[PDB]
Amino acid sequence: GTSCIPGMAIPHNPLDSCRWYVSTRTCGVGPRLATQEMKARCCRQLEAIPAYCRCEAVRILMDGVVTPSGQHEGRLLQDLPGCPRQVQRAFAPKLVTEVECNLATIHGGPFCLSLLG
């Protein structure tokens, strides 16, 4: 509804596909899939989500959240060999920028103001 909460407004474990893409584009660390195929999927998920939830969905990817059912989901941006989470955290909020997914948000444009990174 008017609430960006994991359930409907925001899927369960949002932008899961953005976890492996944020590590490759951020630190150069590649898992198994090619950056473009990774970036296509990732951005596909951020699009599905409505304008006003996008920035929140990204924050959840980085830092996390507790579902109203007491269960927690998020904070996928965890350290990796050669890819500290602070590098990932720094890039993540850019997933909505023009150079990147170029998607409007709560603020009204392809940029997140209230996101840590």
Side-chain angles (χ1 to χ4, degrees), residues 16-45:
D16 30 315
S17 275
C18 289
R19 188 265 167 313
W20 282 132
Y21 167 65
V22 169
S23 357
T24 89
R25 151 89 177 69
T26 294
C27 322
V29 159
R32 174 100 244 80
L33 303 329
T35 290
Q36 188 251 345
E37 191 284 324
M38 308 208 88
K39 155 174 195 79
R41 256 200 159 280
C42 166
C43 290
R44 204 158 266 163
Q45 288 185 325

Short mmCIF file of all heavy atoms in Angstrom, two decimals, residues 16-45:
data_model
loop_
_atom_site.label_atom_id
_atom_site.label_comp_id
_atom_site.label_asym_id
_atom_site.label_seq_id
_atom_site.Cartn_x
_atom_site.Cartn_y
_atom_site.Cartn_z
N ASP A 16 17.50 -9.50 -4.62
CA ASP A 16 18.44 -10.56 -4.29
C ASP A 16 19.49 -10.67 -5.37
O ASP A 16 20.66 -10.94 -5.10
CB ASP A 16 17.71 -11.90 -4.15
CG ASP A 16 16.50 -11.99 -5.04
OD1 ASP A 16 15.73 -11.01 -5.09
OD2 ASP A 16 16.31 -13.04 -5.70
N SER A 17 19.05 -10.45 -6.61
CA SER A 17 19.91 -10.52 -7.79
C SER A 17 20.87 -9.36 -7.87
O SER A 17 21.81 -9.37 -8.65
CB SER A 17 19.05 -10.53 -9.06
OG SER A 17 18.65 -11.85 -9.35
N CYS A 18 20.62 -8.34 -7.05
CA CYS A 18 21.47 -7.18 -7.01
C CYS A 18 22.66 -7.38 -6.06
O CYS A 18 23.58 -6.58 -6.03
CB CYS A 18 20.66 -5.97 -6.56
SG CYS A 18 19.48 -5.37 -7.81
N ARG A 19 22.63 -8.46 -5.29
CA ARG A 19 23.70 -8.74 -4.34
C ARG A 19 24.97 -9.17 -5.06
O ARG A 19 26.07 -8.70 -4.77
CB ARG A 19 23.29 -9.85 -3.36
CG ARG A 19 24.29 -10.07 -2.22
CD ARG A 19 25.28 -11.19 -2.53
NE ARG A 19 26.42 -11.22 -1.61
CZ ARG A 19 27.13 -10.14 -1.26
NH1 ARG A 19 26.83 -8.95 -1.76
NH2 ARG A 19 28.13 -10.26 -0.40
N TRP A 20 24.80 -10.08 -6.01
CA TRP A 20 25.93 -10.56 -6.77
C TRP A 20 26.38 -9.55 -7.83
O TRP A 20 27.53 -9.58 -8.26
CB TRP A 20 25.59 -11.92 -7.37
CG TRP A 20 25.70 -13.03 -6.36
CD1 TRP A 20 24.78 -14.01 -6.12
CD2 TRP A 20 26.80 -13.28 -5.46
NE1 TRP A 20 25.24 -14.86 -5.13
CE2 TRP A 20 26.47 -14.44 -4.72
CE3 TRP A 20 28.03 -12.65 -5.22
CZ2 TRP A 20 27.33 -14.97 -3.74
CZ3 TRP A 20 28.88 -13.18 -4.26
CH2 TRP A 20 28.52 -14.33 -3.53
N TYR A 21 25.49 -8.65 -8.23
CA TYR A 21 25.86 -7.65 -9.21
C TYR A 21 26.60 -6.51 -8.54
O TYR A 21 27.54 -5.96 -9.10
CB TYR A 21 24.63 -7.12 -9.95
CG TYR A 21 24.94 -5.87 -10.75
CD1 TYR A 21 25.82 -5.91 -11.83
CD2 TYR A 21 24.43 -4.63 -10.36
CE1 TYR A 21 26.19 -4.74 -12.49
CE2 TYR A 21 24.81 -3.46 -11.01
CZ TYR A 21 25.69 -3.52 -12.08
OH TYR A 21 26.09 -2.36 -12.69
N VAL A 22 26.17 -6.13 -7.33
CA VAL A 22 26.83 -5.04 -6.60
C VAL A 22 28.28 -5.38 -6.21
O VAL A 22 29.12 -4.49 -6.10
CB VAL A 22 26.03 -4.65 -5.31
CG1 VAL A 22 26.87 -3.73 -4.42
CG2 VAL A 22 24.75 -3.95 -5.69
N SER A 23 28.59 -6.65 -6.01
CA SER A 23 29.96 -7.05 -5.66
C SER A 23 30.89 -7.02 -6.89
O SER A 23 32.05 -6.63 -6.80
CB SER A 23 29.96 -8.45 -5.05
OG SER A 23 28.63 -8.93 -4.94
N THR A 24 30.37 -7.42 -8.05
CA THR A 24 31.19 -7.43 -9.26
C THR A 24 31.46 -6.03 -9.79
O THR A 24 32.59 -5.71 -10.14
CB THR A 24 30.54 -8.29 -10.38
OG1 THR A 24 29.66 -7.48 -11.17
CG2 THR A 24 29.77 -9.44 -9.78
N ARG A 25 30.44 -5.18 -9.83
CA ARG A 25 30.57 -3.81 -10.32
C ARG A 25 31.29 -2.88 -9.32
O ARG A 25 31.91 -1.88 -9.71
CB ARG A 25 29.17 -3.24 -10.63
CG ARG A 25 29.04 -1.73 -10.48
CD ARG A 25 29.39 -1.01 -11.78
NE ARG A 25 29.23 0.45 -11.71
CZ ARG A 25 29.99 1.26 -10.99
NH1 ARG A 25 30.97 0.77 -10.26
NH2 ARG A 25 29.77 2.56 -11.01
N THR A 26 31.17 -3.21 -8.04
CA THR A 26 31.75 -2.43 -6.96
C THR A 26 33.23 -2.73 -6.68
O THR A 26 34.04 -1.81 -6.53
CB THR A 26 30.94 -2.64 -5.65
OG1 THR A 26 29.62 -2.09 -5.80
CG2 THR A 26 31.61 -1.97 -4.50
N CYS A 27 33.58 -4.00 -6.61
CA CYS A 27 34.95 -4.39 -6.30
C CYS A 27 35.59 -5.21 -7.43
O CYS A 27 36.76 -5.59 -7.34
CB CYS A 27 34.97 -5.19 -4.99
SG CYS A 27 33.81 -4.61 -3.70
N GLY A 28 34.82 -5.48 -8.47
CA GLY A 28 35.33 -6.24 -9.60
C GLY A 28 35.21 -7.74 -9.38
O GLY A 28 35.54 -8.51 -10.28
N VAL A 29 34.73 -8.13 -8.21
CA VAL A 29 34.58 -9.54 -7.86
C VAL A 29 33.44 -10.23 -8.61
O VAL A 29 32.27 -9.91 -8.38
CB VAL A 29 34.34 -9.70 -6.34
CG1 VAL A 29 33.68 -11.05 -6.05
CG2 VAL A 29 35.67 -9.59 -5.60
N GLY A 30 33.78 -11.17 -9.48
CA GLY A 30 32.78 -11.89 -10.25
C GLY A 30 32.45 -13.27 -9.69
O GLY A 30 33.36 -14.06 -9.44
N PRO A 31 31.15 -13.60 -9.51
CA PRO A 31 30.70 -14.89 -8.98
C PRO A 31 30.70 -15.99 -10.04
O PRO A 31 31.52 -16.92 -9.97
CB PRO A 31 29.29 -14.60 -8.51
CG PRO A 31 28.80 -13.60 -9.49
CD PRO A 31 30.00 -12.73 -9.82
N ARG A 32 29.77 -15.89 -10.99
CA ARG A 32 29.65 -16.87 -12.07
C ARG A 32 28.90 -16.31 -13.28
O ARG A 32 28.99 -16.86 -14.38
CB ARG A 32 28.94 -18.13 -11.56
CG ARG A 32 28.63 -19.16 -12.65
CD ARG A 32 29.65 -20.29 -12.64
NE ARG A 32 30.46 -20.35 -13.86
CZ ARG A 32 31.50 -19.57 -14.11
NH1 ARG A 32 31.88 -18.65 -13.23
NH2 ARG A 32 32.18 -19.72 -15.24
N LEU A 33 28.16 -15.23 -13.07
CA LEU A 33 27.39 -14.62 -14.15
C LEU A 33 28.01 -13.30 -14.64
O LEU A 33 28.61 -12.57 -13.85
CB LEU A 33 25.95 -14.39 -13.70
CG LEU A 33 25.12 -15.59 -13.20
CD1 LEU A 33 25.54 -16.89 -13.89
CD2 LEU A 33 25.27 -15.72 -11.69
N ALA A 34 27.85 -13.02 -15.93
CA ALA A 34 28.41 -11.81 -16.56
C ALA A 34 27.72 -10.50 -16.16
O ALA A 34 26.51 -10.37 -16.27
CB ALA A 34 28.38 -11.96 -18.08
N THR A 35 28.53 -9.53 -15.74
CA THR A 35 28.06 -8.22 -15.28
C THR A 35 26.79 -7.65 -15.94
O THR A 35 25.96 -7.03 -15.26
CB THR A 35 29.21 -7.16 -15.39
OG1 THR A 35 30.22 -7.44 -14.41
CG2 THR A 35 28.67 -5.76 -15.14
N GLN A 36 26.63 -7.83 -17.25
CA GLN A 36 25.45 -7.32 -17.95
C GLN A 36 24.20 -8.15 -17.64
O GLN A 36 23.13 -7.61 -17.37
CB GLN A 36 25.69 -7.28 -19.46
CG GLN A 36 24.60 -6.57 -20.25
CD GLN A 36 23.76 -7.53 -21.08
OE1 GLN A 36 24.14 -8.68 -21.30
NE2 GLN A 36 22.60 -7.06 -21.55
N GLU A 37 24.36 -9.47 -17.71
CA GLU A 37 23.26 -10.39 -17.42
C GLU A 37 22.86 -10.18 -15.96
O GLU A 37 21.69 -10.27 -15.60
CB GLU A 37 23.71 -11.83 -17.63
CG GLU A 37 22.59 -12.84 -17.60
CD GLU A 37 22.11 -13.12 -16.20
OE1 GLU A 37 22.95 -13.13 -15.27
OE2 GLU A 37 20.89 -13.32 -16.01
N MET A 38 23.86 -9.90 -15.12
CA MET A 38 23.67 -9.67 -13.70
C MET A 38 22.93 -8.35 -13.48
O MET A 38 21.99 -8.28 -12.68
CB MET A 38 25.02 -9.59 -12.98
CG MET A 38 25.95 -10.76 -13.24
SD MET A 38 27.06 -11.07 -11.85
CE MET A 38 26.04 -12.17 -10.85
N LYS A 39 23.38 -7.33 -14.20
CA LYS A 39 22.81 -5.98 -14.13
C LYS A 39 21.41 -5.89 -14.72
O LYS A 39 20.61 -5.02 -14.35
CB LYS A 39 23.75 -5.01 -14.85
CG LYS A 39 23.10 -3.75 -15.40
CD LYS A 39 24.15 -2.81 -15.95
CE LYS A 39 23.60 -1.41 -16.16
NZ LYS A 39 23.53 -0.65 -14.89
N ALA A 40 21.11 -6.79 -15.66
CA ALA A 40 19.80 -6.79 -16.30
C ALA A 40 18.80 -7.24 -15.25
O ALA A 40 17.82 -6.55 -14.99
CB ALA A 40 19.79 -7.75 -17.49
N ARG A 41 19.07 -8.41 -14.68
CA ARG A 41 18.24 -9.03 -13.65
C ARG A 41 18.06 -8.05 -12.50
O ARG A 41 16.96 -7.62 -12.20
CB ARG A 41 18.94 -10.28 -13.11
CG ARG A 41 18.36 -11.61 -13.61
CD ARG A 41 18.75 -12.77 -12.68
NE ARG A 41 17.86 -13.92 -12.82
CZ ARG A 41 16.65 -14.03 -12.26
NH1 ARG A 41 16.17 -13.05 -11.50
NH2 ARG A 41 15.93 -15.12 -12.45
N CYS A 42 19.18 -7.69 -11.88
CA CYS A 42 19.16 -6.76 -10.76
C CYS A 42 18.23 -5.58 -11.00
O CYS A 42 17.30 -5.37 -10.22
CB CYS A 42 20.58 -6.27 -10.48
SG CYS A 42 20.65 -4.82 -9.38
N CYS A 43 18.48 -4.83 -12.07
CA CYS A 43 17.67 -3.65 -12.41
C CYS A 43 16.21 -4.02 -12.69
O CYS A 43 15.31 -3.18 -12.56
CB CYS A 43 18.24 -2.93 -13.64
SG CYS A 43 19.82 -2.05 -13.44
N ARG A 44 15.99 -5.28 -13.08
CA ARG A 44 14.65 -5.79 -13.38
C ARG A 44 13.82 -5.81 -12.12
O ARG A 44 12.63 -5.54 -12.14
CB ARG A 44 14.74 -7.22 -13.93
CG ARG A 44 13.57 -7.64 -14.79
CD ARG A 44 13.97 -8.79 -15.71
NE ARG A 44 14.40 -8.33 -17.04
CZ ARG A 44 15.10 -9.06 -17.90
NH1 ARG A 44 15.46 -10.30 -17.58
NH2 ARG A 44 15.43 -8.56 -19.09
N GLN A 45 14.48 -6.14 -11.01
CA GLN A 45 13.83 -6.21 -9.72
C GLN A 45 13.53 -4.83 -9.16
O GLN A 45 12.47 -4.60 -8.58
CB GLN A 45 14.71 -7.02 -8.76
CG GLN A 45 14.72 -8.51 -9.09
CD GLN A 45 15.50 -9.30 -8.07
OE1 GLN A 45 16.50 -8.83 -7.54
NE2 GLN A 45 15.04 -10.52 -7.78
#
